[PDB]
Design a protein that fits this description.
part of a larger assembly, 12 chains, A mainly alpha, B mainly alpha, C mainly alpha, D mainly alpha, F mainly alpha, G alpha+beta, H mainly alpha, I mainly alpha, J mainly alpha, K mainly alpha, L mainly alpha, A: mainly alpha, 6 helices, 0% strand, G: 4 helices, binds cardiolipin, binds 1,2-diacyl-SN-glycero-3-phosphocholine
Chain lengths: 159, 99, 173, 49, 49, 57, 89, 65, 104, 42, 122, 157
C-alpha cells in the first residue's frame, strides 16, 4: 500500500523461507541460506566477505537492475514536451506525467531483471557457492537471520 | 446364482459392525460423510490423472523362468517371512538349473 | 482450494496414488511387528479411510452404470416397468464400472506418507513391496520416480551399482 | 458473409412494422370498435409484436 | 485371514449365460406381439440350449 | 466416393446452417418471424445507444 | 364426461336397455371411466332449501422451486444469524 | 439491485413452455424412432391440454398405433 | 511519434470523460458501459456467424443435442384412454351432459 | 489473527508476534489518522 | 512362494514344466505329493489322444457332409478340417488343464508341508 | 521418551489443596451438560465443546450453501423441464396413480421439485462439507485422549 515501502519484499531474496529449504538439497539449502543471510543480514559475515558479496551482487543484480530500470524509464521519455503547443506550455503537467511514467517503467524493468537473473545468480555463481562452503550456515542461522531481517525492516519502517 | 458371493458382503459391512459407540471415547472420530465427499473428489482426481496424465507402463519380462521369484539380498533388507529362507534356497537352485 | 487439506484421508493431485486393489495387496504382504507405533498409526488411519471408501465406491459408480444400462436397453425409459432388464444389465455393468474405479489409483496423504517416508518404516514398506509384489512395485516405482522421489529401492536409480530387479519402462531422463 | 445487417437490409426491415400495421388496418377496416390511434405511435416492444 | 474372497473377474465371466437367457426371454416376450411361432422357435431353441 | 459423398453431405448441411444464421432476418421462413425481429431489435439498441450519448451531451 | 355422481345418475340415456336396442357396446363408454371426482374436499351442509356443496381447498399443488427458495431466505438468514451468535456467545 | 436478479423470477419459469419449432422443421424422410417419438409426444401433450373431444379421441387411437 | 500523440489523445479523451463524470453518477456510467460491452459481444458473435468452422461447431452441438430423444410410455393397464380420461377435470363442466336440465 | 499467522510464517513465536503486531497496528492507525487529517485540510 | 496379485505374471510353460519335474523327482517332497503328480500324468494323457481321434473321425464324416461334399476342394478341405482342429484343441487343452490343476494342488501341498506360505500355519 | 521426577506423596496441606481444586472444578460444570464423573470426563467435555463449535460452523455453511445453490444451480436445472428432448412441452407421464393435474403446471412443477429438492439438499450438504473446517477437532495421532484431572486444571493457594 501507499503507507509503507514494499520494494524490498520481492528483491534480494527477502522471499526465501523454510519452504524453499525443505525441498532443497544440502548444498542447495546452504546456498539459499547463505544468499538470504548475505542479502538481508550482512553483519553475520566478515567484512572482506561482505565486500566480495556486495561486488558480486552489484555487477549481477543490484547495479544491473538499476541500469535496466534507468533504460526502461528512458524509454518513456521519447518526447519530453508531451503536451505542448505554441499558445500554451504545460511544464507542471509534463513534469507530473514524467513522474508518473518513468518511475513505473523503472519499477517494471527492475522487477523484470530481478525475476530473470536472481535465480540464475543464486544457482550459477561461483562466489556464492564458495562463500556458502566457507560459512556453512545451518537452519538455526537461517531462522535467526529471518527474525533479524524482519526486525530490521520493522525498525526502518519506524524510523 | 449370485449367492456364493456373500464373503464380499461380510467384508464390506462387518467393518462397519466393529465400529464402537462414539461417546465411548476410543478415538472420537465420525468420518463417514467427510470421507464420502473427500473420496468423491479423490476419484475425480484419480480418473482425470488416469485419462490425461502419466500412466505407469505394464511391460515386464515374460520369458525368463522364475524371474519374479526374488530372493533376499541387501536390495530387499531381509525383513521377509522368517521361513522363506528355504524358498530362497529353492530359488537359488532353480536359477542354477536354467544357468 | 479445500478447507480440509490437513485431513490425513485427503490428498492433492501430486500425492502417491494407489488403487484399492493395490492397497489391499500391499496390506497382504506386511507384518505389524516390523513397524514402529507411528507406522501402525498411519496404517490404522488408512484402514478406516479405506473401509469407508470401499463402502462408497459402488455409490460413486452407480450413475454411470445406470446410464450405460439404460443405453443398452434402448431409447425407451420404462420406469417401474423395465426394472428387470435394467437391473440385470446393472448387476452386469456396475461390476465393470467398479472394476474401472477400483483399478484406478487415487492420491492420498496417507499413501504418500506410508510409501515415501524416509524413516525405517518407509524403507521396510518399500522393500517389502519390492520383493513380494514385483508388479505393484513396478508401477509404484514408475510413479514415484515420475514424482521426483529418489529412493534406492526404485528400479530407475542411476546412482546404483547393482542392476535393476525388473524391466525399466521407458521414461524421459 | 456476416450476421450483422447492412443499410440495404435495414431498409427492408424498417418497412415490416408499418406493413404489419397497414395489414391490420386493411383486414379490420370495417370494425367501428377498432381504434388506430394506438397504432399511430408504438414502442420498440409493440413494433416487434 | 480367511476372508474367502472370490475374484470378481471370474464371477463376471461366469455370469454370461444367465444374463443372456434373461435378455433373450425379454426379447421373446416383447416380440410376441407381432411375431409367429415358427419365427420365434429360433429364440426358444437358443434359450433351451 | 462414399467418403466424399458423406463429406459433401456434411458440408451441404453446414453451409445451409451458415446461410440461415447470416440471412434469417430477410425471410419469414422461421415461424413468427423471430430472428428478423432480433436483428431489428439490435438496430434499435444501437440507435438508442448513440442517441443516449447525444442526450448526455 | 361427469364430475358429480348426482349429475351422472340423474338422466342417463346410455343405459343397457338402450344400448341393447342398438347392440353396440363401445369400449370408450366403460363406466369405469365415466365419472371421477375432483380430488378436492367437497362436503355437504344444509342450506336454505336443500343440501349445499362446500369445497374445502387449502393449498395449491403447482408450486415451483423458485417460490420455495424465495420463501426460505428469511429462515436461512435466521439460521446463519443464530449460528454466528452461538459462536460469538 | 440484488432483488432484480435474485428475487424477480424469470418469465420462463412461470408460464407454460411453447412448442420448440426448430425440432419439427427439417425432419428426416423416415419413420424412425425420433419421428415416431415426436408424433407420440405431440399427441400426448394435445390430449393432456385440449378441451376438444373428437380430436382427443382421434389422437388416442393414433397414440395406441 | 506514435507515443506522445497517443498520450495526447488519451489526455483529451480523459478531459472529456472528466466532464462527463462531473455531471453524472457512477451507476449510470456502469450501466452504459455494461450495455455497450454486451452490444460489442453481440456484434462479435454476429460477425462470426457465417464462418464455416463456427457453423460446424454449432452443427455438432445441435446434432449432439437432438441425438438422444427418449420415449416415455404408459405402462399401466389403463394405457392411453385411462390417462386421457384422467386429464378431463378442467373441461367436464363445459359439457352438455353437465348442464342444469330438470326433468320436471 | 491474520497478522499473527503472517508473522509466525516468518521465524517467530506466538508470544513474540503479539508485540510486533500491536506496534504495526498502532503505526497503521497513526498513518490512517494522518491521512484523514490531510484529507480534511485539503 | 509365488508372487500373488493381478499385476503378477502368470505361470509360463517353462515354469510349469520345471515345477512339475521338481515335484515328481526331487526329495524334500513327501510320497503323497509325488504320487499326486504321477496320477496327474497318468490320467491326463488319455484326453489329448481322445480329442485328436474324435476330431479325426468327425472330420472324416464332415468332409462328406451334404453341403461340404459339393464344395470346391479348398473350401471343402477347410470346412472338413475345422471339426478336427476344434476337437484336437479341446483334447490338448483338457489334458493340460487337468494335469496342471492336479500339479498345482501338489505344489500347494508341498508349500504347506514345508511352511513356505505366510499366513498359513497349523 | 524420558521420565520426570516423581514428587514425594503429598502432605495433608497438599491433599487439601487438591481437594479444593477438584471441588472448584466440579462446581464449573453446567447443569445442561450431562457428562458423568470419570477420568476422561474433562477430556470428553473438551472434545464436546470443540465438536459443538464445528457443528455451528457447519450449519451456517449449510444454510449459506442453500442460498448459494438456489439461483446458481437448481433454478437453471429446473430450466430443463420446460420441454422434452423432442421439443414438445412437458406433460405428465403417470407411473401407477393417474393423478389429475388440473392446475396450471402441476405436472411440470411437481416433477421439477421432485428432481430439484434432493439436488438442492445434496449440493448444500456438499458445500457445507467442502467449506467448513474440522481442523480444531481433528487429531491424526489421537494424542488428545489423555486424561486431564480437575486438580491439574485449577491452581489453589
Ligand atoms: C398432532 C399435532 C398437530 C399440530 C402441531 C402444530 C402445528 C404443526 C404444523 C404447522 C403448520 O402450519 O402446518 C400447516 C402446513 C400447511 O401449510 P399452510 O399454512 O396450511 O399453507 C397455507 C396455504 O395453504 C399455502 O398454500 P399455497 O399453495 O398458497 O402456498 C404454497 C404452499 C403449498 O402448500 C404446501 O406446500 C403444504 C404442504 C403440506 O407451500 C408453502 O407455503 C410451504 C413452503 C414454503 C417455502 C419453504 C419455507 C421454509 C422451509 C424451511 C427452510 C428451508 C429449508 O401443513 C404441514 O406442514 C403438514 C400438512 C400435512 C402433510 C401430510 C400429512 C399426512
Ligand atoms: C428443502 C426442504 C424444505 C422444503 C420446503 C417446501 C416443502 C413443500 C414443497 C411443496 C409440497 C407440495 O404440496 O407439492 C405439490 C405436490 C403435488 O403432488 P401431486 O400433483 O398431487 O402428485 C401426487 C403425488 O404426491 C405424487 O407423488 P409421487 O409418487 O410422484 O412422489 C412421491 C413424493 C412423496 O413426497 C412426499 O410425500 C412429500 C415429501 O415425492 C417424493 O418422494 C420426492 C422425493 C423423491 C424424488 C425422486 C425423483 C428424483 C430422484 C433423483 C434426485 C437427485 C437429483 C438428480 C439429478 C439428475 C442429474 C442432474 O403435493 C404433494 O405431493 C402432496 C404432499 C405435499 C407435502 C406434504 C408433507
Ligand atoms: C481489461 C479489459 C478491458 C475491456 C474493455 C475495453 C476494451 C474492449 O473490450 O472494448 C470493447 C468495446 C469497443 O468499443 P469502441 O467504442 O470501439 O472502443 C472504445 C474503447 O474501448 C474505449 O472505451 P471507452 O473510453 O468508451 O470506455 C471504456 C473504457 C473506460 O476507460 C477509459 O476510457 C480509460 C481511458 C484512459 C484513462 C487515463 C488517461 C491518462 C493515461 C496516462 C498514462 C500515463 C501514466 C500516468 C497515469 C497512470 C495511471 C495508473 O474502459 C477501458 O478502456 C478498459 C481498460 C481501462 C484501463 C486501462 C487504461 C489504459 C490507458 C493507457 C495507459 C498507458 C500507460 C503507459 C504506457 O468497448 C466497450 O465495450 C466499452 C465498455 C467496456 C466495459 C468493460 C467492462 C469490464 C471488462 C469486461 C471484460 C472482462
Ligand atoms: C439322419 C439321416 C437319415 C437318412 C436320411 O434322412 O436320408 C435322406 C436321404 C434322401 O433325401 P433326399 O434329399 O430326398 O435325397 C437326396 C438326393 O438323392 C441327393 O443325394 P445327396 O447328394 O444329397 O446325398 C444324400 C445325403 C443325405 O444322406 C444321408 O445323410 C444318409 C447318411 C447315412 C445314414 C445312415 O448325403 C449323404 O448321403 C452323405 C452322407 C455322408 C456321411 C454323413 O436318404 C438317402 O440319400 C439315403 C439314405 C440311406 C441310409 C442307409
Ligand atoms: C451408508 C452407511 C452409513 C455410512 C456413514 C457411517 C454412519 C454415520 C457416521 C457419522 C457421520 C456424521 O455424523 O458425520 C458428521 C460429523 C459431525 O457433523 P456436523 O457437521 O457436526 O453436523 C452435526 C449434525 O448433527 C449432523 O450433521 P450431518 O452432516 O451428519 O447430517 C446432515 C447431512 C446428512 O448427510 C447425509 O446423510 C449424507 C447423505 C449422502 C451420503 C450417504 C452415505 C454415507 O445432510 C442432510 O441431512 C441434508 C440432506 C442430505 C441428503 C441429500 C439427498 C436428498 C435427501 C432428501 C430427499 C427429499 C426428502 C423430502 C423433502 O462429522 C464429524 O464429527 C467430523 C469429525 C470431527 C471429529 C474428529 C476427531 C479426530 C480425533 C479427535 C481425538 C480427540
Ligand atoms: C443380510 C445382509 C448382511 C450384510 C453383512 C452383515 C455382516 O457383516 O454380517 C456378519 C455378521 C457376523 O460377523 P462374524 O463374521 O463375526 O460372525 C460371528 C459368528 N459367531 C457369532 C457365530 C462367532 O453377521 C451378523 O451379525 C448377522 C448377519 C445377518 C443379519 C440379518
Ligand atoms: C443372493 C445375494 C447374496 C449377496 C451377494 C452380495 C455380493 C457383494 C455385493 C456388494 C459388495 C461388493 C464389494 C466389492 C468390494 C471390492 C473391493 C476391491 O478392492 O475390489 C477390487 C477387486 C480386484 O479384483 P478381484 O475381485 O479379482 O480381487 C482380487 C482377488 N482377491 C479376491 C484375492 C482379492 O475387484 C475389482 O477390481 C473388480 C470388481 C469390483 C467390485 C464390484 C462390486 C459390485 C457391487 C455391486 C454388485 C451388485 C449390483 C446390483 C445392482 C442392482
Amino acid at each position: 500500500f501507499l503507507f509503507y515501502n514494499q520494494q524490498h519484499k520481492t528483491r534480494n531474496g527477502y522471499f526465501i523461507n523454510h519452504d524453499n529449504l525443505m525441498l532443497a538439497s544440502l548444498e542447495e539449502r546452504k546456498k539459499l541460506i547463505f544468499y538470504f543471510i548475505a542479502n538481508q543480514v550482512p553483519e553475520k559475515l566478515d567484512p572482506v566477505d561482505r565486500v566480495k558479496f556486495n561486488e558480486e551482487l552489484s555487477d549481477n543484480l543490484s547495479t544491473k537492475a538499476r541500469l535496466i530500470g534507468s533504460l526502461t524509464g528512458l524509454i518513456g521519455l521519447v518526447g519530453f514536451p508531451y503536451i505542448s503547443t505554441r499558445i500554451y506550455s504545460r511544464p507542471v503537467l509534463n513534469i507530473g506525467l514524467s513522474l508518473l511514467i518513468c518511475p513505473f517503467l523503472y519499477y517494471v524493468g527492475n522487477q523484470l531483471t530481478y525475476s530473470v537473473w536472481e535465480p540464475k545468480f543464486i544457482a550459477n555463481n561461483n562466489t556464492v557457492c564458495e562463500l556458502s562452503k566457507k560459512y556453512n550456515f545451518t537452519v538455526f542461522d537461517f531462522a535467526q537471520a529471518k527474525k533479524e531481517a524482519h526486525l530490521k525492516a520493522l525498525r526502518t519502517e519506524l524510523v | 446364482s449370485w449367492a456364493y458371493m456373500y464373503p464380499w458382503l461380510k467384508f464390506i459391512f462387518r467393518k462397519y459392525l466393529d465400529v464402537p459407540y462414539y461417546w465411548f471415547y476410543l478415538n472420537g472420530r465420525e468420518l463417514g460423510i467427510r470421507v464420502f465427499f473427500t473420496d468423491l473428489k479423490l476419484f475425480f482426481y484419480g480418473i482425470t490423472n488416469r485419462l490425461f496424465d502419466f500412466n505407469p507402463s505394464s511391460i515386464k519380462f515374460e520369458k525368463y523362468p522364475f524371474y519374479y521369484w526374488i530372493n533376499s539380498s541387501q536390495l530387499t533388507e531381509f525383513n521377509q517371512y522368517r521361513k522363506f529362507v528355504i524358498r530362497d534356497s529353492i530359488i537359488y537352485s532353480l536359477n542354477n538349473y536354467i544357468i | 482450494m479445500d478447507n480440509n487439506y490437513h485431513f490425513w484421508g485427503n490428498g492433492d493431485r501430486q500425492d502417491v496414488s494407489l488403487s484399492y486393489e493395490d492397497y489391499y495387496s500391499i496390506l497382504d504382504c506386511l507384518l505389524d511387528e516390523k513397524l514402529s507405533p507411528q507406522g501402525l498409526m498411519k496404517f490404522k488411519n488408512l484402514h478406516e479411510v479405506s473401509m469407508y471408501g470401499v463402502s462408497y465406491v459402488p455409490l460413486y459408480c452407480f450413475p454411470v452404470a445406470y446410464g450405460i444400462s439404460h443405453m443398452l436397453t434402448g431409447k425407451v425409459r420404462r420406469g417401474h416397468s423395465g426394472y428387470r432388464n435394467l437391473f440385470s444389465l446393472m448387476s452386469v455393468v456396475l461390476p465393470f464400472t467398479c472394476w474401472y474405479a477400483y483399478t484406478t489409483p487415487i492420491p492420498r496423504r496417507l499413501y504418500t506418507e506410508i510409501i515415501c517416508s524416509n524413516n525405517a518404516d518407509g524403507a521396510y514398506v518399500r522393500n517389502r513391496i519390492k520383493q513380494q509384489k514385483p508388479g505393484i512395485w513396478r508401477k509404484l516405482s514408475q510413479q514415484l520416480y515420475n514424482k521426483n522421489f529418489r529412493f534406492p529401492e526404485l528400479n530407475q536409480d542411476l546412482t546404483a551399482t547393482e542392476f535393476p530387479l525388473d524391466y525399466v519402462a521407458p521414461h524421459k531422463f | 458473409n456476416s450476421g450483422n445487417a447492412l443499410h440495404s437490409e435495414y431498409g427492408y426491415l424498417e418497412l415490416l412494422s408499418n406493413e404489419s400495421v397497414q395489414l391490420y388496418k386493411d383486414y379490420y377496416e370495417s370494425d367501428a370498435e377498432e381504434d388506430f390511434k394506438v397504432f399511430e405511435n408504438l414502442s420498440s416492444k409493440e413494433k416487434l409484436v | 485371514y480367511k476372508t474367502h474372497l472370490f475374484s470378481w473377474r471370474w464371477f463376471l465371466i461366469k455370469l454370461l449365460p444367465s444374463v443372456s437367457i434373461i435378455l433373450l426371454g425379454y426379447y421373446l416376450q416383447l416380440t410376441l406381439k407381432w411375431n409367429l411361432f415358427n419365427k420365434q422357435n429360433t429364440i426358444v431353441l437358443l434359450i433351451t440350449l | 466416393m462414399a467418403i466424399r459423398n458423406f463429406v459433401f453431405k456434411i458440408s451441404n448441411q453446414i453451409q445451409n446452417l451458415a446461410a440461415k444464421r447470416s440471412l434469417a432476418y430477410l425471410n419469414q421462413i422461421d415461424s413468427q418471424s423471430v430472428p428478423s425481429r432480433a436483428t431489428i431489435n439490435m438496430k434499435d439498441q444501437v440507435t438508442q445507444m448513440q442517441r443516449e450519448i447525444d442526450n448526455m451531451a | 364426461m361427469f364430475r358429480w355422481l348426482f349429475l351422472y345418475w340423474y338422466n342417463s340415456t346410455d343405459t343397457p336397455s338402450a344400448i341393447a336396442k342398438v347392440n353396440l357396446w363401445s369400449y370408450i363408454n366403460l363406466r369405469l371411466f365415466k365419472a371421477r371426482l375432483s380430488s378436492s374436499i367437497a362436503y355437504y351442509i344444509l342450506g336454505l332449501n336443500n343440501l349445499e356443496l362446500k369445497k374445502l381447498k387449502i393449498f395449491y399443488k403447482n408450486t415451483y422451486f423458485d417460490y420455495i427458495y424465495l420463501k426460505s431466505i428469511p429462515c436461512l438468514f435466521l439460521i446463519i444469524f443464530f449460528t454466528n451468535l452461538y459462536l460469538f456467545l | 439491485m440484488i432483488w432484480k436478479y435474485l428475487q424477480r423470477t424469470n418469465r420462463g419459469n412461470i408460464i407454460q413452455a411453447g412448442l420448440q419449432h426448430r425440432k419439427f422443421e427439417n425432419l428426416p424422410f423416415k419413420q424412425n424412432f425420433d419421428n415416431l417419438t415426436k408424433a407420440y409426444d405431440l399427441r400426448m401433450w394435445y390430449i393432456s391440454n385440449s378441451p376438444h373431444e373428437a380430436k382427443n379421441l382421434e389422437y388416442v387411437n393414433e397414440l395406441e398405433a | 511519434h506514435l507515443y506522445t500523440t497517443e498520450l495526447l489523445i488519451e489526455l483529451i479523451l480523459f478531459k472529456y470523460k472528466l466532464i462527463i463524470l462531473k455531471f453524472s453518477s457512477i451507476k449510470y456510467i456502469l450501466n452504459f458501459n455494461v450495455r455497450k460491452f454486451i452490444l460489442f459481444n453481440l456484434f462479435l458473435i454476429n460477425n462470426y456467424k457465417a464462418y464455416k468452422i463456427n457453423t460446424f461447431f454449432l452443427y455438432i452441438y445441435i446434432y449432439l443435442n437432438n441425438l438422444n430423444i427418449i420415449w416415455y410410455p404408459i405402462f399401466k393397464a389403463y394405457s392411453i384412454f385411462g390417462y386421457y380420461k384422467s386429464t378431463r377435470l378442467n373441461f367436464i363442466d363445459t359439457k352438455n351432459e353437465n348442464i342444469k336440465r330438470i326433468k320436471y | 489473527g491474520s497478522c499473527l499467522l503472517i508473522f509466525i510464517q516468518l521465524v517467530f513465536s506466538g508470544i513474540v508476534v503479539l508485540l510486533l503486531d500491536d506496534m504495526l497496528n498502532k503505526g497503521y492507525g497513526l498513518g490512517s489518522g494522518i491521512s484523514l487529517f490531510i484529507a480534511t485540510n485539503i | 512362494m509365488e508372487p500373488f496379485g493381478t499385476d503378477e505374471r502368470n505361470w509360463t510353460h517353462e515354469e510349469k514344466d520345471i515345477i512339475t519335474r521338481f515335484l515328481k523327482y526331487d526329495k524334500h517332497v513327501n510320497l503323497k505329493t509325488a504320487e499326486m503328480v504321477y496320477s496327474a500324468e497318468v490320467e491326463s494323457a488319455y484326453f489329448g489322444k481322445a480329442g485328436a481321434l474324435a476330431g479325426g473321425v468327425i472330420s472324416a464324416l464332415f468332409f462328406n457332409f451334404p453341403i461340404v461334399r459339393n464344395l470346391p476342394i479348398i473350401r471343402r478341405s477347410v470346412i472338413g478340417v475345422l471339426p478336427f482342429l476344434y476337437c484336437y484343441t479341446w483334447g490338448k487343452n483338457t489334458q493340460e488343464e487337468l494335469r496342471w490343476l492336479k500339479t498345482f494342488a501338489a505344489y500347494q501341498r508341498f508349500v504347506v508341508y514345508h511352511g513356505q506360505h505366510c499366513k498359513l500355519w497349523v | 521418551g524420558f521420565e520426570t521426577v516423581v514428587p514425594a506423596p503429598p502432605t495433608r496441606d497438599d491433599e487439601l489443596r487438591m481437594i479444593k481444586a477438584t471441588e472448584e472444578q466440579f462446581l464449573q460444570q453446567p447443569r445442561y451438560k450431562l457428562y458423568m464423573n470419570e477420568a476422561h470426563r474433562i477430556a470428553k467435555m473438551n472434545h464436546g465443546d470443540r465438536h459443538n463449535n464445528i457443528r455451528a460452523h457447519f450449519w451456517s455453511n449449510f444454510a449459506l450453501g442453500l442460498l448459494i445453490t438456489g439461483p446458481i444451480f437448481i433454478i437453471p436445472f429446473g430450466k430443463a423441464f420446460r420441454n422434452l428432448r423432442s421439443g414438445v412441452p412437458y406433460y405428465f407421464r403417470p407411473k401407477y396413480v393417474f393423478t389429475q393435474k388440473n392446475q396450471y403446471n402441476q405436472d411440470r412443477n411437481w416433477g421439477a421439485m421432485k428432481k430439484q429438492i434432493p439436488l438442492w439438499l445434496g449440493l448444500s450438504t456438499a458445500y457445507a462439507y467442502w467449506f467448513t473446517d474440522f481442523s480444531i477437532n481433528d487429531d491424526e495421532w489421537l494424542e488428545k485422549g489423555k486424561v486431564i484431572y480437575p486438580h491439574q486444571t485449577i491452581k489453589v493457594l
